[PDB]
Design a protein around this ligand. Structure first.
Ligand SMILES: Nc1nc(-c2ccc(Cc3ccccc3)cc2)co1
Ligand SMILES: [Yb+3]
Ligand SMILES: [Yb+3]
Ligand SMILES: [Yb+3]
Ligand SMILES: [Yb+3]
Length: 607
């Protein structure tokens, strides 16, 4: 049972296919159309079924060419409203029918952000993009909005002819709209079954550049050249990922660089990974996010979590593969450096939530929890830490990678639970069951807080970061003169970020130390978003009033939640910036992504 879905479960009926025909109306901020669901009964004498919806207007439901009865239930908060459909003829087990639902979305759809021309790079055209994970697909179309059900899909999308539509699917042509010569229809096919959280749409003034044999980058024209360079390692990462995971089954691997309000670093929409433009550091240094989205083509998109309580299966295995791709490209010492950084992010999340908090468990219970409120680094890093621990326990990365490949092959096209994973781990490692039974499974999977054992990490690349951080933390006023730009000369961007992260873990530092850091290191000049984020948090938490306009600008000029939520929270916690933080939120809230708007409002206690 999926506690986040109000739809008929997969034991009752299963959507096999969606045919979406829709029109994007930027004047009304609506998507209007038909969703034709091919549904297979899983029981005898099926006479009704229930779909998820959220803020959808339903015009009619058509089966066998006639309108049928349907009823929308009372709204259940973030879950939306269940839609019960009375079938005209009882179905036997395995019988399939087509249900055609005529619907329109709400301008406030939590799946969608509608941008005005002034919010875009080009300033002439508007822009739309979706983000369905976890349970926002129901705010675009009626569906069994659960990852326990996988379907293929086809779509035809009518847009103003000056604009381009793309989806999480193979492009299947474009024509003038035969109903309206001011519009174009773009067609799409997704022939690999997916959970519906992977459906995605973008409409805007998009251009493409080829960067590899199976990859185009898409953005507004102003970002194409920088994006092509930034993501040039993509084909190399795809080849490594195929070596680790088995064949790439999805045909194309395109990248779409969204406007700056995209809420996440990336989203693994099949055939078309969506990425934040905050990756555009100019030196490819944030390419781990691409390695992570590539990895999801296996762990998440092929093997899927059955319910959101088991989300760690998706993210932990993806971080694990991501860090192997980066280790194959840049060395094993680098993989251990990134692994140890992730432990630090886990320490931070556990300290923030508290060590007894239920969202620090690996397997969570999202009954009556908004999944967007539970989202954190925990499933990423506690999930990675478990796999990295098991790697060490079971004989190292070569051996554990054999398990990963076999796991993907076993559960390809399926939706699974933690128990399914664990049973297969035990089956695969049958000759090492004595080692597996040493694991404290109850603590790792079901207990809050830090895991009960910390893995072993190579320290080679970390040591200079720790040493410099400790020099600053232990410095007194009379030591500040000893710091110099030469301190950084042998540090990569990754090490500078880790130096900041280590130092931020001990924040605040005295204001004179932070002033001295700017004087000698000129961190205000650095445009790398991860470095800048941690530098600005360090400054604000250390009560540097000069950093307030910089922090407010970064919090509002982009909307990646990783950056925006903690910058707003730091600014609200500094008495000198509190009022500006709340005022700035209130002035921007109407033109924010709807999920970001909600979560920053929760964080700032501003309703
Ligand atoms: N260990 C652990 N898992 C979670 C968790 C589970 C599911 C989700 C849903 C979600 C929401 C938004 C975007 C992507 C996924 C979030 C967190 C927490 O702790
Ligand atoms: Yb029957
Ligand atoms: Yb075709
Ligand atoms: Yb039409
Ligand atoms: Yb078993």
């Amino acid at each position: 049972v999926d506690t986040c879905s109000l739809a008929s479960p997969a034991s009752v009926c299963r959507t096999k296919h969606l045919h979406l025909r829709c029109s994007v109306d930027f004047t009304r901020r609506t998507l209007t159309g038909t969703a034709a669901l091919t549904v297979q009964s899983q029981e005898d004498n099926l006479r009704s079924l229930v779909l998820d919806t959220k803020d959808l207007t339903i015009e009619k439901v058509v089966i066998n060419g006639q309108e049928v009865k349907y009823a929308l239930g009372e709204r259940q908060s973030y879950k939306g409203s269940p839609m019960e459909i009375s079938l005209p003829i009882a179905l036997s087990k395995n019988q399939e029918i087509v249900i055609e639902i005529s619907f329109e979305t709400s301008p406030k759809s939590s799946a969608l952000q509608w941008l005005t021309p002034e919010q875009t790079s080009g300033k002439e055209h508007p822009y739309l993009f979706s983000q369905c994970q976890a349970i926002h697909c129901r705010a675009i179309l009626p569906c069994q909005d659960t990852p326990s059900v996988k379907l293929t899909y086809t779509a035809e999308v009518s847009v103003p002819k000056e604009l381009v539509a793309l989806m999480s699917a193979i492009r299947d042509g474009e024509t003038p709209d035969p109903e309206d010569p001011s519009r174009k229809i773009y067609k799409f096919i997704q022939k690999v079954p997916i959970p519906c959280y992977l459906i995605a749409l973008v409409v805007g003034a998009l251009e493409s550049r080829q960067i590899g044999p199976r990859t185009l980058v898409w953005s507004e024209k102003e970002q194409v050249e920088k994006s092509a360079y930034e993501f040039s390692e993509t084909e190399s990462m795809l080849k490594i990922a195929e070596d680790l995971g088995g064949p790439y089954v999805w045909g194309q691997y395109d990248l779409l660089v969204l406007p700056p309000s995209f809420p996440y670093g990336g989203m693994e929409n099949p055939c078309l990974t969506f990425v934040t433009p905050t990756l555009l550091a100019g030196d490819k240094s944030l390419s781990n996010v691409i390695a992570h989205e590539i990895s999801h083509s296996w762990t998440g998109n092929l093997v899927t979590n059955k319910t959101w309580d088991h989300f760690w299966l998706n993210e932990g295995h993806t971080v694990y593969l991501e860090r192997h791709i980066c280790g194959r490209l840049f060395g094993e010492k680098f993989r251990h450096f990134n692994a140890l950084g992730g432990w630090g992010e886990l320490q931070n999340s556990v300290k923030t939530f508290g060590e007894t908090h239920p969202f620090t468990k690996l397997v969570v219970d999202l009954t009556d929890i908004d999944p967007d409120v539970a989202y954190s680094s925990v499933p990423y890093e506690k999930g990675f830490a478990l796999l990295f621990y098991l790697e060490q326990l079971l004989g190292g990365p070569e051996i554990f990678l054999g398990f990963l490949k076999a796991y993907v092959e076993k559960f390809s096209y399926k939706s699974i639970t933690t128990d399914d994973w664990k049973d297969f781990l035990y089956s695969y490692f049958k000759d090492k069951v004595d080692v597996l039974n040493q694991v404290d499974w109850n603590a790792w999977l079901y207990s809050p807080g830090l895991p009960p054992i910390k893995p072993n990490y190579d320290m080679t690349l970390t040591n200079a970061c720790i040493a410099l951080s400790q020099r600053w933390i232990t410095a007194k006023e009379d030591d500040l003169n000893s710091f110099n730009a030469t301190d950084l000369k042998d540090l990569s961007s990754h090490q500078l970020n880790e130096f900041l992260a280590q130092t931020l873990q001990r924040a605040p530092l005295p204001l004179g130390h932070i002033k001295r850091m700017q004087e000698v290191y000129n961190f205000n000049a650095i445009n790398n978003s991860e470095i800048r984020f941690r530098w600005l948090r360090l400054c604000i938490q250390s009560k540097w009033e000069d950093a307030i306009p910089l922090a407010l600008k970064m919090a509002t000029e982009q909307g990646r939640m990783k950056f925006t939520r903690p910058l707003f929270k730091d600014l609200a916690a500094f008495d000198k910036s509190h009022d500006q933080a709340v005022r700035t939120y209130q002035e921007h809230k109407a033109s924010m992504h709807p999920v970001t708007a909600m979560l920053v409002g929760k964080d700032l206690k501003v309703d």
